[PDB]
Amino acid sequence: KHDYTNPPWNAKVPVQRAMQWMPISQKAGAAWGVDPQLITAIIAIESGGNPNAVSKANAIGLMQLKASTSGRDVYRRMGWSGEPTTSELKNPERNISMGAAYLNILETGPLAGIEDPKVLQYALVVSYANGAGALLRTFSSDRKKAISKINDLDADEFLEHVARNHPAPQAPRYIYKLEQALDAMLEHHH
């Protein structure tokens, strides 16, 4: 039973830095059918808006994408050989484009059939964090049955499930941080 609100995450500054990229996020989210606010929240959480960011096994750039895994998954989807370069992933436009593509792959692939857009949003950030498989297997070894069980919950019950059952402490924490980020973005819309 993960203490996922501890310690408090102060989203104000990460979101202010992420919001500088919002034009790109709106362009890429437009193109890929992905919500720009979700893109921006992920930039805030991942890189804090730093396009030169690096973290876990050479995940790179604003959305901290790894070339050999996620990057490759995007290239495969686009019918391209190979995978993004480090330089490409440091480019804000390319990085946000590929992150939006990867989010779309998750939404339309392993997570297809989640009907409540808010539960889908939570399932997306948990899947971005630690993979869709770990999430789905907290429900069932069968994909369709897992999606069915997810579809029985609302967003609050979904978080509670993830907090009680997901093996990764990062999973419920990502939902907590996403909501901190979405709240902080409200200061930026008049």
From Swiss-Prot:
It is found in: Cell outer membrane. Its main location: membrane. It catalyses: Endolytic cleavage of the (1->4)-beta-glycosidic linkage between N-acetylmuramic acid (MurNAc) and N-acetylglucosamine (GlcNAc) residues in peptidoglycan with concomitant formation of a 1,6-anhydrobond in the MurNAc residue. Keywords: Cell outer membrane, Cell wall biogenesis/degradation, Lipoprotein, Lyase, Membrane, Palmitate, Signal. It is a lipid-anchor. Its EC number is 4.2.2.n2. GO terms for molecular function: lytic endotransglycosylase activity; peptidoglycan lytic transglycosylase activity. GO terms for biological process: cell division; cell wall macromolecule catabolic process; cell wall organization; peptidoglycan metabolic process. It is an enzyme of class 4 (lyase). GO terms for cellular component: cell outer membrane. The keyword 4Fe-4S does not apply. It holds the Pfam family SLT. Belongs to the transglycosylase Slt family. PANTHER family: ENDO-TYPE MEMBRANE-BOUND LYTIC MUREIN TRANSGLYCOSYLASE A (PTHR37423:SF4), SOLUBLE LYTIC MUREIN TRANSGLYCOSYLASE-RELATED (PTHR37423). This is Endo-type membrane-bound lytic murein transglycosylase A. It comes from Escherichia coli (strain K12).
